[PDB]
Amino acid sequence: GSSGSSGNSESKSTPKRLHVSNIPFRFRDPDLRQMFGQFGKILDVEIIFNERGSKGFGFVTFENSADADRAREKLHGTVVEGRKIEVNNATARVMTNSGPSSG
């Protein structure tokens, strides 16, 4: 960018998995596919939950990294059924591109 270099082995956007919490227990994969789907075509979805404790949070895997940022923020602060949900980037399934850019 500044120094003066080019030529990237991979020049394609990689799926961006987001993390959501504070969501109704009635919610399911289907919903996420629709709700979030509005932003774009979802790739994968997994909403972990259980009885032993309070496990109310799932994950959404988008097809594009850009579209994931636009939505993430959009949903980041939405009142669903009178319940504010939290949306933040996850660092579980991803391999930061070794380049001149850092987090």
Side-chain angles (χ1 to χ4, degrees):
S2 65
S3 203
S5 305
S6 200
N8 275 353
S9 197
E10 176 180 88
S11 286
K12 208 88 278 198
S13 286
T14 49
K16 206 162 179 279
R17 194 180 270 194
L18 308 172
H19 163 263
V20 66
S21 81
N22 206 93
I23 63 170
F25 296 95
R26 61 194 77 157
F27 276 28
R28 300 279 171 75
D29 146 282
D31 296 284
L32 290 184
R33 277 183 88 198
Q34 276 155 340
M35 179 150 129
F36 289 71
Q38 76 191 332
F39 298 106
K41 168 169 151 162
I42 293 184
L43 291 188
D44 301 292
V45 186
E46 174 72 279
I47 302 181
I48 300 168
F49 32 46
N50 207 56
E51 67 200 278
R52 183 175 154 84
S54 291
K55 284 271 161 279
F57 59 73
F59 287 63
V60 189
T61 310
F62 280 78
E63 80 284 65
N64 296 341
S65 65
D67 284 274
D69 187 301
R70 276 90 160 71
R72 183 208 89 65
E73 287 186 300
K74 282 281 170 158
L75 288 175
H76 185 30
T78 32
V79 179
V80 174
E81 275 298 335
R83 305 190 69 157
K84 210 164 280 160
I85 60 164
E86 271 150 81
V87 180
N88 308 102
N89 155 258
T91 329
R93 272 201 208 284
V94 62
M95 30 155 67
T96 182
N97 281 253
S98 185
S101 72
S102 50

mmCIF file of all heavy atoms in Angstrom, residues 11-61:
data_model
loop_
_atom_site.group_PDB
_atom_site.id
_atom_site.type_symbol
_atom_site.label_atom_id
_atom_site.label_comp_id
_atom_site.label_asym_id
_atom_site.label_seq_id
_atom_site.Cartn_x
_atom_site.Cartn_y
_atom_site.Cartn_z
ATOM 1 N N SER A 11 -6.763 -13.650 -3.809
ATOM 2 C CA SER A 11 -7.443 -12.364 -3.908
ATOM 3 C C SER A 11 -8.957 -12.545 -3.892
ATOM 4 O O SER A 11 -9.676 -11.936 -4.683
ATOM 5 C CB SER A 11 -7.019 -11.637 -5.187
ATOM 6 O OG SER A 11 -5.701 -11.128 -5.071
ATOM 7 N N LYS A 12 -9.434 -13.390 -2.983
ATOM 8 C CA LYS A 12 -10.864 -13.653 -2.861
ATOM 9 C C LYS A 12 -11.320 -13.515 -1.411
ATOM 10 O O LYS A 12 -10.562 -13.800 -0.483
ATOM 11 C CB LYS A 12 -11.191 -15.056 -3.378
ATOM 12 C CG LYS A 12 -12.602 -15.189 -3.922
ATOM 13 C CD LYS A 12 -12.669 -14.825 -5.395
ATOM 14 C CE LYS A 12 -12.764 -13.320 -5.594
ATOM 15 N NZ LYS A 12 -13.253 -12.971 -6.956
ATOM 16 N N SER A 13 -12.560 -13.078 -1.224
ATOM 17 C CA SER A 13 -13.116 -12.901 0.112
ATOM 18 C C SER A 13 -13.434 -14.248 0.751
ATOM 19 O O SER A 13 -13.979 -15.144 0.104
ATOM 20 C CB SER A 13 -14.380 -12.041 0.053
ATOM 21 O OG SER A 13 -14.061 -10.679 -0.176
ATOM 22 N N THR A 14 -13.090 -14.388 2.029
ATOM 23 C CA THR A 14 -13.337 -15.626 2.756
ATOM 24 C C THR A 14 -14.507 -15.471 3.722
ATOM 25 O O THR A 14 -14.711 -14.417 4.323
ATOM 26 C CB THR A 14 -12.091 -16.072 3.545
ATOM 27 O OG1 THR A 14 -11.571 -14.973 4.302
ATOM 28 C CG2 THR A 14 -11.017 -16.600 2.605
ATOM 29 N N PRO A 15 -15.294 -16.546 3.874
ATOM 30 C CA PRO A 15 -16.456 -16.556 4.768
ATOM 31 C C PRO A 15 -16.142 -15.954 6.134
ATOM 32 O O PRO A 15 -15.100 -16.239 6.725
ATOM 33 C CB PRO A 15 -16.789 -18.043 4.901
ATOM 34 C CG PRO A 15 -16.299 -18.656 3.636
ATOM 35 C CD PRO A 15 -15.109 -17.836 3.189
ATOM 36 N N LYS A 16 -17.050 -15.124 6.632
ATOM 37 C CA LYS A 16 -16.874 -14.484 7.930
ATOM 38 C C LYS A 16 -17.934 -14.955 8.920
ATOM 39 O O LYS A 16 -19.119 -14.665 8.761
ATOM 40 C CB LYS A 16 -16.939 -12.962 7.786
ATOM 41 C CG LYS A 16 -16.174 -12.214 8.864
ATOM 42 C CD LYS A 16 -15.901 -10.775 8.459
ATOM 43 C CE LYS A 16 -15.166 -10.018 9.555
ATOM 44 N NZ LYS A 16 -16.096 -9.533 10.612
ATOM 45 N N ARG A 17 -17.499 -15.686 9.943
ATOM 46 C CA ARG A 17 -18.411 -16.198 10.957
ATOM 47 C C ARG A 17 -18.578 -15.194 12.095
ATOM 48 O O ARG A 17 -17.599 -14.766 12.708
ATOM 49 C CB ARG A 17 -17.899 -17.530 11.510
ATOM 50 C CG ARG A 17 -18.936 -18.295 12.315
ATOM 51 C CD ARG A 17 -18.372 -19.602 12.849
ATOM 52 N NE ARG A 17 -18.570 -20.706 11.914
ATOM 53 C CZ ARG A 17 -18.415 -21.984 12.242
ATOM 54 N NH1 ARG A 17 -18.066 -22.318 13.476
ATOM 55 N NH2 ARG A 17 -18.615 -22.931 11.334
ATOM 56 N N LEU A 18 -19.823 -14.822 12.371
ATOM 57 C CA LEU A 18 -20.118 -13.869 13.435
ATOM 58 C C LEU A 18 -20.690 -14.577 14.658
ATOM 59 O O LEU A 18 -21.213 -15.688 14.558
ATOM 60 C CB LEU A 18 -21.103 -12.810 12.938
ATOM 61 C CG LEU A 18 -20.732 -12.107 11.632
ATOM 62 C CD1 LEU A 18 -21.874 -11.223 11.156
ATOM 63 C CD2 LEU A 18 -19.461 -11.290 11.808
ATOM 64 N N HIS A 19 -20.589 -13.926 15.814
ATOM 65 C CA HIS A 19 -21.098 -14.494 17.056
ATOM 66 C C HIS A 19 -22.251 -13.656 17.604
ATOM 67 O O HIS A 19 -22.127 -12.442 17.764
ATOM 68 C CB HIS A 19 -19.981 -14.585 18.096
ATOM 69 C CG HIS A 19 -20.480 -14.780 19.496
ATOM 70 N ND1 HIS A 19 -20.646 -13.739 20.385
ATOM 71 C CD2 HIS A 19 -20.849 -15.901 20.156
ATOM 72 C CE1 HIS A 19 -21.095 -14.214 21.533
ATOM 73 N NE2 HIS A 19 -21.227 -15.523 21.421
ATOM 74 N N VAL A 20 -23.371 -14.312 17.888
ATOM 75 C CA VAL A 20 -24.545 -13.628 18.416
ATOM 76 C C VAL A 20 -24.995 -14.248 19.735
ATOM 77 O O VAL A 20 -24.977 -15.468 19.897
ATOM 78 C CB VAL A 20 -25.716 -13.669 17.418
ATOM 79 C CG1 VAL A 20 -26.202 -15.097 17.221
ATOM 80 C CG2 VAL A 20 -26.850 -12.772 17.890
ATOM 81 N N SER A 21 -25.397 -13.399 20.675
ATOM 82 C CA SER A 21 -25.848 -13.862 21.982
ATOM 83 C C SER A 21 -27.082 -13.088 22.436
ATOM 84 O O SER A 21 -27.529 -12.159 21.764
ATOM 85 C CB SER A 21 -24.730 -13.711 23.014
ATOM 86 O OG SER A 21 -24.652 -12.381 23.493
ATOM 87 N N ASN A 22 -27.630 -13.479 23.582
ATOM 88 C CA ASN A 22 -28.812 -12.823 24.129
ATOM 89 C C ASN A 22 -30.002 -12.976 23.187
ATOM 90 O O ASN A 22 -30.782 -12.042 22.998
ATOM 91 C CB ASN A 22 -28.531 -11.339 24.375
ATOM 92 C CG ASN A 22 -29.404 -10.759 25.469
ATOM 93 O OD1 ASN A 22 -29.017 -10.730 26.638
ATOM 94 N ND2 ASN A 22 -30.590 -10.293 25.095
ATOM 95 N N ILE A 23 -30.135 -14.160 22.598
ATOM 96 C CA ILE A 23 -31.231 -14.437 21.678
ATOM 97 C C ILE A 23 -32.178 -15.486 22.250
ATOM 98 O O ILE A 23 -31.765 -16.428 22.928
ATOM 99 C CB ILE A 23 -30.710 -14.921 20.312
ATOM 100 C CG1 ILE A 23 -29.958 -16.245 20.468
ATOM 101 C CG2 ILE A 23 -29.812 -13.866 19.684
ATOM 102 C CD1 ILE A 23 -29.613 -16.904 19.151
ATOM 103 N N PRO A 24 -33.479 -15.325 21.968
ATOM 104 C CA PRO A 24 -34.512 -16.251 22.444
ATOM 105 C C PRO A 24 -34.122 -17.709 22.240
ATOM 106 O O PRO A 24 -33.425 -18.049 21.283
ATOM 107 C CB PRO A 24 -35.728 -15.898 21.581
ATOM 108 C CG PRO A 24 -35.535 -14.464 21.224
ATOM 109 C CD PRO A 24 -34.042 -14.226 21.165
ATOM 110 N N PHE A 25 -34.574 -18.570 23.145
ATOM 111 C CA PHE A 25 -34.270 -19.995 23.066
ATOM 112 C C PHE A 25 -35.122 -20.673 21.998
ATOM 113 O O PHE A 25 -34.802 -21.769 21.536
ATOM 114 C CB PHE A 25 -34.503 -20.664 24.422
ATOM 115 C CG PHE A 25 -33.584 -20.169 25.501
ATOM 116 C CD1 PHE A 25 -33.982 -19.155 26.357
ATOM 117 C CD2 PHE A 25 -32.322 -20.718 25.659
ATOM 118 C CE1 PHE A 25 -33.138 -18.697 27.351
ATOM 119 C CE2 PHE A 25 -31.473 -20.264 26.652
ATOM 120 C CZ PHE A 25 -31.881 -19.253 27.499
ATOM 121 N N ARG A 26 -36.210 -20.016 21.609
ATOM 122 C CA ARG A 26 -37.110 -20.555 20.598
ATOM 123 C C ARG A 26 -36.492 -20.444 19.207
ATOM 124 O O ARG A 26 -36.859 -21.183 18.293
ATOM 125 C CB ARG A 26 -38.450 -19.819 20.632
ATOM 126 C CG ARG A 26 -38.336 -18.331 20.348
ATOM 127 C CD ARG A 26 -39.611 -17.591 20.724
ATOM 128 N NE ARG A 26 -39.727 -17.402 22.167
ATOM 129 C CZ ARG A 26 -40.467 -16.449 22.725
ATOM 130 N NH1 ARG A 26 -41.152 -15.606 21.965
ATOM 131 N NH2 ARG A 26 -40.522 -16.340 24.047
ATOM 132 N N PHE A 27 -35.554 -19.516 19.054
ATOM 133 C CA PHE A 27 -34.885 -19.308 17.774
ATOM 134 C C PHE A 27 -34.196 -20.584 17.306
ATOM 135 O O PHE A 27 -33.790 -21.416 18.117
ATOM 136 C CB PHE A 27 -33.864 -18.173 17.887
ATOM 137 C CG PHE A 27 -34.463 -16.807 17.711
ATOM 138 C CD1 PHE A 27 -35.786 -16.568 18.048
ATOM 139 C CD2 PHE A 27 -33.703 -15.762 17.211
ATOM 140 C CE1 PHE A 27 -36.340 -15.311 17.888
ATOM 141 C CE2 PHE A 27 -34.252 -14.504 17.050
ATOM 142 C CZ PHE A 27 -35.571 -14.279 17.387
ATOM 143 N N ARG A 28 -34.065 -20.732 15.991
ATOM 144 C CA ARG A 28 -33.425 -21.908 15.415
ATOM 145 C C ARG A 28 -32.611 -21.533 14.179
ATOM 146 O O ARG A 28 -32.593 -20.375 13.764
ATOM 147 C CB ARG A 28 -34.475 -22.958 15.047
ATOM 148 C CG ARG A 28 -35.298 -23.437 16.232
ATOM 149 C CD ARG A 28 -34.550 -24.488 17.039
ATOM 150 N NE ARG A 28 -35.237 -24.806 18.289
ATOM 151 C CZ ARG A 28 -36.330 -25.557 18.357
ATOM 152 N NH1 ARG A 28 -36.860 -26.063 17.252
ATOM 153 N NH2 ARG A 28 -36.895 -25.803 19.531
ATOM 154 N N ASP A 29 -31.940 -22.521 13.598
ATOM 155 C CA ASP A 29 -31.125 -22.295 12.410
ATOM 156 C C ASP A 29 -31.930 -21.590 11.325
ATOM 157 O O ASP A 29 -31.499 -20.592 10.746
ATOM 158 C CB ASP A 29 -30.582 -23.624 11.878
ATOM 159 C CG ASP A 29 -30.475 -23.642 10.366
ATOM 160 O OD1 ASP A 29 -31.518 -23.815 9.700
ATOM 161 O OD2 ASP A 29 -29.351 -23.481 9.848
ATOM 162 N N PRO A 30 -33.129 -22.118 11.038
ATOM 163 C CA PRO A 30 -34.020 -21.555 10.020
ATOM 164 C C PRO A 30 -34.130 -20.038 10.121
ATOM 165 O O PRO A 30 -33.891 -19.322 9.148
ATOM 166 C CB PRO A 30 -35.369 -22.210 10.326
ATOM 167 C CG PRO A 30 -35.022 -23.510 10.965
ATOM 168 C CD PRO A 30 -33.708 -23.306 11.687
ATOM 169 N N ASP A 31 -34.492 -19.552 11.304
ATOM 170 C CA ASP A 31 -34.633 -18.119 11.533
ATOM 171 C C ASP A 31 -33.392 -17.369 11.059
ATOM 172 O O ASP A 31 -33.467 -16.523 10.167
ATOM 173 C CB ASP A 31 -34.877 -17.840 13.017
ATOM 174 C CG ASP A 31 -36.187 -18.421 13.507
ATOM 175 O OD1 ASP A 31 -37.248 -17.831 13.207
ATOM 176 O OD2 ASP A 31 -36.156 -19.465 14.191
ATOM 177 N N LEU A 32 -32.250 -17.684 11.661
ATOM 178 C CA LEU A 32 -30.991 -17.041 11.301
ATOM 179 C C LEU A 32 -30.815 -16.998 9.787
ATOM 180 O O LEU A 32 -30.398 -15.983 9.229
ATOM 181 C CB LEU A 32 -29.816 -17.779 11.943
ATOM 182 C CG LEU A 32 -29.688 -17.648 13.461
ATOM 183 C CD1 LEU A 32 -28.433 -18.350 13.955
ATOM 184 C CD2 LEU A 32 -29.676 -16.182 13.870
ATOM 185 N N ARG A 33 -31.135 -18.107 9.128
ATOM 186 C CA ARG A 33 -31.012 -18.196 7.678
ATOM 187 C C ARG A 33 -31.862 -17.129 6.994
ATOM 188 O O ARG A 33 -31.493 -16.611 5.939
ATOM 189 C CB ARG A 33 -31.432 -19.586 7.194
ATOM 190 C CG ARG A 33 -30.333 -20.628 7.306
ATOM 191 C CD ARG A 33 -30.773 -21.967 6.737
ATOM 192 N NE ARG A 33 -30.500 -22.071 5.307
ATOM 193 C CZ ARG A 33 -31.081 -22.961 4.510
ATOM 194 N NH1 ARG A 33 -31.965 -23.819 5.003
ATOM 195 N NH2 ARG A 33 -30.780 -22.993 3.218
ATOM 196 N N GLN A 34 -32.999 -16.806 7.602
ATOM 197 C CA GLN A 34 -33.901 -15.802 7.049
ATOM 198 C C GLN A 34 -33.503 -14.402 7.510
ATOM 199 O O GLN A 34 -33.134 -13.554 6.699
ATOM 200 C CB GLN A 34 -35.342 -16.098 7.464
ATOM 201 C CG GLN A 34 -36.041 -17.102 6.562
ATOM 202 C CD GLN A 34 -37.163 -17.840 7.267
ATOM 203 O OE1 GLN A 34 -37.208 -17.896 8.496
ATOM 204 N NE2 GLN A 34 -38.077 -18.409 6.490
ATOM 205 N N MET A 35 -33.585 -14.169 8.815
ATOM 206 C CA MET A 35 -33.234 -12.873 9.383
ATOM 207 C C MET A 35 -31.935 -12.350 8.781
ATOM 208 O O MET A 35 -31.923 -11.326 8.097
ATOM 209 C CB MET A 35 -33.099 -12.978 10.904
ATOM 210 C CG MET A 35 -32.707 -11.668 11.570
ATOM 211 S SD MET A 35 -33.356 -11.523 13.247
ATOM 212 C CE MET A 35 -31.868 -11.096 14.149
ATOM 213 N N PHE A 36 -30.840 -13.058 9.038
ATOM 214 C CA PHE A 36 -29.535 -12.664 8.523
ATOM 215 C C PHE A 36 -29.493 -12.784 7.001
ATOM 216 O O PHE A 36 -28.855 -11.980 6.323
ATOM 217 C CB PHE A 36 -28.435 -13.530 9.143
ATOM 218 C CG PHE A 36 -28.181 -13.225 10.591
ATOM 219 C CD1 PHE A 36 -29.111 -13.569 11.558
ATOM 220 C CD2 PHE A 36 -27.010 -12.599 10.986
ATOM 221 C CE1 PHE A 36 -28.880 -13.292 12.893
ATOM 222 C CE2 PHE A 36 -26.773 -12.317 12.319
ATOM 223 C CZ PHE A 36 -27.708 -12.666 13.274
ATOM 224 N N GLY A 37 -30.178 -13.792 6.474
ATOM 225 C CA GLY A 37 -30.207 -13.998 5.036
ATOM 226 C C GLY A 37 -30.483 -12.719 4.273
ATOM 227 O O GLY A 37 -29.966 -12.521 3.174
ATOM 228 N N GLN A 38 -31.304 -11.851 4.854
ATOM 229 C CA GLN A 38 -31.651 -10.586 4.219
ATOM 230 C C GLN A 38 -30.401 -9.852 3.747
ATOM 231 O O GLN A 38 -30.383 -9.267 2.663
ATOM 232 C CB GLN A 38 -32.438 -9.703 5.188
ATOM 233 C CG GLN A 38 -31.574 -9.051 6.257
ATOM 234 C CD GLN A 38 -32.393 -8.400 7.353
ATOM 235 O OE1 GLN A 38 -33.526 -7.972 7.128
ATOM 236 N NE2 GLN A 38 -31.825 -8.321 8.551
ATOM 237 N N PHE A 39 -29.355 -9.887 4.565
ATOM 238 C CA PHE A 39 -28.099 -9.225 4.232
ATOM 239 C C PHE A 39 -27.422 -9.908 3.045
ATOM 240 O O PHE A 39 -26.851 -9.249 2.179
ATOM 241 C CB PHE A 39 -27.161 -9.228 5.440
ATOM 242 C CG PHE A 39 -27.708 -8.489 6.626
ATOM 243 C CD1 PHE A 39 -28.177 -9.178 7.733
ATOM 244 C CD2 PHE A 39 -27.753 -7.104 6.635
ATOM 245 C CE1 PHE A 39 -28.682 -8.500 8.825
ATOM 246 C CE2 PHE A 39 -28.257 -6.419 7.725
ATOM 247 C CZ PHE A 39 -28.722 -7.118 8.823
ATOM 248 N N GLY A 40 -27.491 -11.236 3.017
ATOM 249 C CA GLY A 40 -26.881 -11.986 1.934
ATOM 250 C C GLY A 40 -27.170 -13.472 2.025
ATOM 251 O O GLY A 40 -28.021 -13.901 2.804
ATOM 252 N N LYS A 41 -26.461 -14.260 1.223
ATOM 253 C CA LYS A 41 -26.645 -15.707 1.215
ATOM 254 C C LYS A 41 -25.776 -16.371 2.279
ATOM 255 O O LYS A 41 -24.560 -16.489 2.116
ATOM 256 C CB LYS A 41 -26.307 -16.276 -0.164
ATOM 257 C CG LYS A 41 -26.202 -17.791 -0.188
ATOM 258 C CD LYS A 41 -26.123 -18.323 -1.611
ATOM 259 C CE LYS A 41 -25.336 -19.622 -1.676
ATOM 260 N NZ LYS A 41 -25.610 -20.373 -2.933
ATOM 261 N N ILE A 42 -26.407 -16.806 3.364
ATOM 262 C CA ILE A 42 -25.690 -17.462 4.451
ATOM 263 C C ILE A 42 -25.103 -18.794 3.998
ATOM 264 O O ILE A 42 -25.708 -19.514 3.202
ATOM 265 C CB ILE A 42 -26.608 -17.704 5.665
ATOM 266 C CG1 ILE A 42 -27.019 -16.372 6.294
ATOM 267 C CG2 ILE A 42 -25.910 -18.588 6.687
ATOM 268 C CD1 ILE A 42 -27.851 -16.528 7.548
ATOM 269 N N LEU A 43 -23.922 -19.118 4.511
ATOM 270 C CA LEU A 43 -23.252 -20.367 4.161
ATOM 271 C C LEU A 43 -23.564 -21.457 5.180
ATOM 272 O O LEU A 43 -24.049 -22.531 4.826
ATOM 273 C CB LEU A 43 -21.739 -20.150 4.076
ATOM 274 C CG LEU A 43 -21.248 -19.292 2.909
ATOM 275 C CD1 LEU A 43 -19.729 -19.315 2.830
ATOM 276 C CD2 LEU A 43 -21.859 -19.772 1.599
ATOM 277 N N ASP A 44 -23.284 -21.171 6.448
ATOM 278 C CA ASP A 44 -23.538 -22.127 7.521
ATOM 279 C C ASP A 44 -24.153 -21.432 8.732
ATOM 280 O O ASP A 44 -24.077 -20.211 8.865
ATOM 281 C CB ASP A 44 -22.241 -22.830 7.923
ATOM 282 C CG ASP A 44 -21.595 -23.562 6.764
ATOM 283 O OD1 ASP A 44 -22.172 -24.568 6.301
ATOM 284 O OD2 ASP A 44 -20.511 -23.129 6.319
ATOM 285 N N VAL A 45 -24.763 -22.219 9.611
ATOM 286 C CA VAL A 45 -25.392 -21.680 10.813
ATOM 287 C C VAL A 45 -25.407 -22.713 11.934
ATOM 288 O O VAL A 45 -25.694 -23.888 11.706
ATOM 289 C CB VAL A 45 -26.835 -21.220 10.532
ATOM 290 C CG1 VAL A 45 -27.421 -20.531 11.755
ATOM 291 C CG2 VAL A 45 -26.875 -20.302 9.321
ATOM 292 N N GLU A 46 -25.098 -22.265 13.147
ATOM 293 C CA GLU A 46 -25.076 -23.151 14.305
ATOM 294 C C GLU A 46 -25.403 -22.384 15.583
ATOM 295 O O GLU A 46 -24.648 -21.506 16.002
ATOM 296 C CB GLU A 46 -23.709 -23.823 14.436
ATOM 297 C CG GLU A 46 -23.552 -24.644 15.706
ATOM 298 C CD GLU A 46 -24.362 -25.926 15.675
ATOM 299 O OE1 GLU A 46 -25.577 -25.866 15.955
ATOM 300 O OE2 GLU A 46 -23.780 -26.987 15.371
ATOM 301 N N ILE A 47 -26.531 -22.721 16.197
ATOM 302 C CA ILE A 47 -26.957 -22.065 17.427
ATOM 303 C C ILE A 47 -26.858 -23.011 18.618
ATOM 304 O O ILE A 47 -27.772 -23.797 18.877
ATOM 305 C CB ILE A 47 -28.403 -21.546 17.316
ATOM 306 C CG1 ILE A 47 -28.532 -20.579 16.138
ATOM 307 C CG2 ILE A 47 -28.823 -20.869 18.613
ATOM 308 C CD1 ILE A 47 -29.925 -20.010 15.972
ATOM 309 N N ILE A 48 -25.747 -22.931 19.339
ATOM 310 C CA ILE A 48 -25.530 -23.780 20.506
ATOM 311 C C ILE A 48 -26.508 -23.438 21.625
ATOM 312 O O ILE A 48 -26.816 -22.268 21.858
ATOM 313 C CB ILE A 48 -24.091 -23.647 21.039
ATOM 314 C CG1 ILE A 48 -23.085 -24.064 19.965
ATOM 315 C CG2 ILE A 48 -23.913 -24.487 22.295
ATOM 316 C CD1 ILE A 48 -21.656 -23.701 20.303
ATOM 317 N N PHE A 49 -26.995 -24.464 22.313
ATOM 318 C CA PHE A 49 -27.938 -24.273 23.408
ATOM 319 C C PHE A 49 -28.041 -25.531 24.265
ATOM 320 O O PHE A 49 -27.620 -26.611 23.853
ATOM 321 C CB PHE A 49 -29.319 -23.902 22.861
ATOM 322 C CG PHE A 49 -29.624 -24.528 21.530
ATOM 323 C CD1 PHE A 49 -29.373 -25.871 21.308
ATOM 324 C CD2 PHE A 49 -30.160 -23.771 20.501
ATOM 325 C CE1 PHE A 49 -29.653 -26.450 20.083
ATOM 326 C CE2 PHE A 49 -30.443 -24.343 19.276
ATOM 327 C CZ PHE A 49 -30.188 -25.685 19.066
ATOM 328 N N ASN A 50 -28.600 -25.382 25.461
ATOM 329 C CA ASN A 50 -28.757 -26.505 26.377
ATOM 330 C C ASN A 50 -29.601 -26.110 27.584
ATOM 331 O O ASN A 50 -29.952 -24.942 27.752
ATOM 332 C CB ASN A 50 -27.387 -27.007 26.842
ATOM 333 C CG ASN A 50 -27.405 -28.475 27.217
ATOM 334 O OD1 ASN A 50 -27.794 -29.327 26.417
ATOM 335 N ND2 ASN A 50 -26.984 -28.779 28.439
ATOM 336 N N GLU A 51 -29.924 -27.090 28.423
ATOM 337 C CA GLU A 51 -30.729 -26.844 29.613
ATOM 338 C C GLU A 51 -29.840 -26.578 30.824
ATOM 339 O O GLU A 51 -30.121 -25.696 31.634
ATOM 340 C CB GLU A 51 -31.648 -28.035 29.892
ATOM 341 C CG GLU A 51 -30.903 -29.295 30.302
ATOM 342 C CD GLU A 51 -31.727 -30.551 30.097
ATOM 343 O OE1 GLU A 51 -32.561 -30.862 30.973
ATOM 344 O OE2 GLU A 51 -31.537 -31.224 29.063
ATOM 345 N N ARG A 52 -28.765 -27.352 30.941
ATOM 346 C CA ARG A 52 -27.833 -27.203 32.055
ATOM 347 C C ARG A 52 -27.099 -25.868 31.973
ATOM 348 O O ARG A 52 -25.950 -25.806 31.539
ATOM 349 C CB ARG A 52 -26.825 -28.354 32.061
ATOM 350 C CG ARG A 52 -25.864 -28.314 33.239
ATOM 351 C CD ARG A 52 -24.970 -29.543 33.268
ATOM 352 N NE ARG A 52 -23.698 -29.280 33.936
ATOM 353 C CZ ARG A 52 -23.536 -29.334 35.254
ATOM 354 N NH1 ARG A 52 -24.557 -29.645 36.039
ATOM 355 N NH2 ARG A 52 -22.347 -29.081 35.788
ATOM 356 N N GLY A 53 -27.771 -24.801 32.397
ATOM 357 C CA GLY A 53 -27.167 -23.482 32.363
ATOM 358 C C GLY A 53 -27.883 -22.541 31.417
ATOM 359 O O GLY A 53 -29.032 -22.779 31.042
ATOM 360 N N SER A 54 -27.204 -21.466 31.028
ATOM 361 C CA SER A 54 -27.785 -20.481 30.122
ATOM 362 C C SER A 54 -26.955 -20.358 28.848
ATOM 363 O O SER A 54 -26.022 -19.558 28.774
ATOM 364 C CB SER A 54 -27.884 -19.119 30.812
ATOM 365 O OG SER A 54 -28.855 -19.140 31.844
ATOM 366 N N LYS A 55 -27.302 -21.159 27.845
ATOM 367 C CA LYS A 55 -26.591 -21.141 26.573
ATOM 368 C C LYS A 55 -27.462 -20.544 25.471
ATOM 369 O O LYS A 55 -28.079 -21.268 24.692
ATOM 370 C CB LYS A 55 -26.162 -22.558 26.184
ATOM 371 C CG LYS A 55 -24.956 -23.062 26.960
ATOM 372 C CD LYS A 55 -23.654 -22.697 26.265
ATOM 373 C CE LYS A 55 -22.475 -22.765 27.222
ATOM 374 N NZ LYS A 55 -22.363 -21.533 28.051
ATOM 375 N N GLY A 56 -27.507 -19.217 25.413
ATOM 376 C CA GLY A 56 -28.304 -18.543 24.403
ATOM 377 C C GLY A 56 -27.458 -17.727 23.447
ATOM 378 O O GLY A 56 -27.389 -16.503 23.559
ATOM 379 N N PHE A 57 -26.813 -18.404 22.503
ATOM 380 C CA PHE A 57 -25.966 -17.733 21.524
ATOM 381 C C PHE A 57 -25.621 -18.670 20.370
ATOM 382 O O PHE A 57 -25.363 -19.856 20.574
ATOM 383 C CB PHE A 57 -24.682 -17.231 22.188
ATOM 384 C CG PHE A 57 -23.865 -18.323 22.814
ATOM 385 C CD1 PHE A 57 -23.154 -19.214 22.025
ATOM 386 C CD2 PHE A 57 -23.805 -18.461 24.193
ATOM 387 C CE1 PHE A 57 -22.400 -20.221 22.598
ATOM 388 C CE2 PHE A 57 -23.053 -19.465 24.771
ATOM 389 C CZ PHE A 57 -22.349 -20.347 23.974
ATOM 390 N N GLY A 58 -25.620 -18.128 19.156
ATOM 391 C CA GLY A 58 -25.307 -18.928 17.986
ATOM 392 C C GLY A 58 -24.247 -18.288 17.113
ATOM 393 O O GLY A 58 -23.678 -17.256 17.469
ATOM 394 N N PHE A 59 -23.977 -18.903 15.966
ATOM 395 C CA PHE A 59 -22.975 -18.388 15.039
ATOM 396 C C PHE A 59 -23.505 -18.395 13.608
ATOM 397 O O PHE A 59 -24.240 -19.297 13.210
ATOM 398 C CB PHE A 59 -21.695 -19.221 15.124
ATOM 399 C CG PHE A 59 -20.903 -18.977 16.378
ATOM 400 C CD1 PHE A 59 -21.435 -19.283 17.620
ATOM 401 C CD2 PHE A 59 -19.628 -18.439 16.313
ATOM 402 C CE1 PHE A 59 -20.709 -19.058 18.775
ATOM 403 C CE2 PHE A 59 -18.897 -18.213 17.464
ATOM 404 C CZ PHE A 59 -19.439 -18.521 18.697
ATOM 405 N N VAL A 60 -23.125 -17.379 12.838
ATOM 406 C CA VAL A 60 -23.560 -17.267 11.452
ATOM 407 C C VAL A 60 -22.368 -17.119 10.513
ATOM 408 O O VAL A 60 -21.560 -16.200 10.655
ATOM 409 C CB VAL A 60 -24.505 -16.067 11.255
ATOM 410 C CG1 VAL A 60 -25.114 -16.089 9.861
ATOM 411 C CG2 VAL A 60 -25.590 -16.064 12.321
ATOM 412 N N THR A 61 -22.264 -18.030 9.550
ATOM 413 C CA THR A 61 -21.169 -18.002 8.586
ATOM 414 C C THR A 61 -21.619 -17.395 7.263
ATOM 415 O O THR A 61 -22.397 -17.997 6.523
ATOM 416 C CB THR A 61 -20.614 -19.415 8.327
ATOM 417 O OG1 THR A 61 -20.330 -20.065 9.572
ATOM 418 C CG2 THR A 61 -19.350 -19.354 7.483
#
